[PDB]
Amino acid sequence: STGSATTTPIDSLDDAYITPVQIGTPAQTLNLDFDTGSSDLWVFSSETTASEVDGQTIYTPSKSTTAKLLSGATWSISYGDGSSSSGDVYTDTVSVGGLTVTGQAVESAKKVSSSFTEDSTIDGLLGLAFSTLNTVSPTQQKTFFDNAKASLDSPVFTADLGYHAPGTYNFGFIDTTAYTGSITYTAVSTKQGFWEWTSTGYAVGSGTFKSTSIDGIADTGTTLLYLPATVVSAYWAQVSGAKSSSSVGGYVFPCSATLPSFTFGVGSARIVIPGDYIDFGPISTGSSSCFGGIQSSAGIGINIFGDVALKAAFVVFNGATTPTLGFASK
């Protein structure tokens, strides 16, 4: 089997992407944030504290003939941005772009933190990291991809995120029309539950490539590119007036600037992030200070190849017995 779904930016900055997901019978369609940095499929629901729901579409298990309470199971998660959610668990039928999993754990939120409430466009998350990170207790549950894997034509999914435009998540096949050149594959460590890999280096604009190992995670659920402070400083030093602002919480730059590109290495190959992808616009409405799309990972504890990086590539998440990651230009 295969599936293919379009993923759409939630706003004009590409702060996140939402993908329609069918849950239950008859289908209830919710727009979920596909997150290769976590492993819980959780949704706003009829059980969510009413004061914490503000415009989201909810899953109502009592209206699904295929929903079954997973008795005794609870979940609770905290994300790297400090947001969190928790609740209980149902199993139900879940379909993405024509690909159907029966008995999928659908984690129903009883509580969500303010960041989720305030974002009307995201109805929940669909985790695509390794199932070892799943938070369901006392019986850990499998991700949608893990459940689908054995049925898929090939045990893979691909992320093809757009810049200021829709893109595509495919399951079970590699669309050879979706990228240019060849796909370069690179080794993955699953020890921390993430799609963790090692970039071979970087360049800033038309500058020379610096060969240096940068361990990090491929994370569709993180907006920006978080790299070591040395790398980030080298980038922003090429932008007149750019500085790290403690008050704002990262690098800012004059909105009048033209940003250089940023290249990262995948083996002997190179992915180029155009300068425009690194612009996240005014820090507040009407400001002439703009927020940068490359920020320091210092204090996160891990480097994160988030959407800024991933949207410059066609990315293969290969869930074969020995997982790997593939990157192509597009």
From Swiss-Prot:
Reactions catalysed, as given in the entry: Hydrolysis of proteins with specificity similar to that of pepsin A, prefers hydrophobic residues at P1 and P1', but does not cleave 14-Ala-|-Leu-15 in the B chain of insulin or Z-Glu-Tyr. Clots milk
Cystine pairs: 255-290
UniProt entry tagged with the keyword Flavoprotein: no
MF-aspect GO terms: aspartic-type endopeptidase activity
Catalytic residues, chain numbering: 35, 199
Domain Peptidase A1: 17-328
UniProt keyword terms in alphabetical order: Aspartyl protease, Disulfide bond, Hydrolase, Protease, Signal, Zymogen
EC number, UniProt record: 3.4.23.22
GO process annotations (BP): proteolysis
Family to which this protein belongs: Belongs to the peptidase A1 family.
Protein name as it appears in the record: Endothiapepsin
Organism: Cryphonectria parasitica
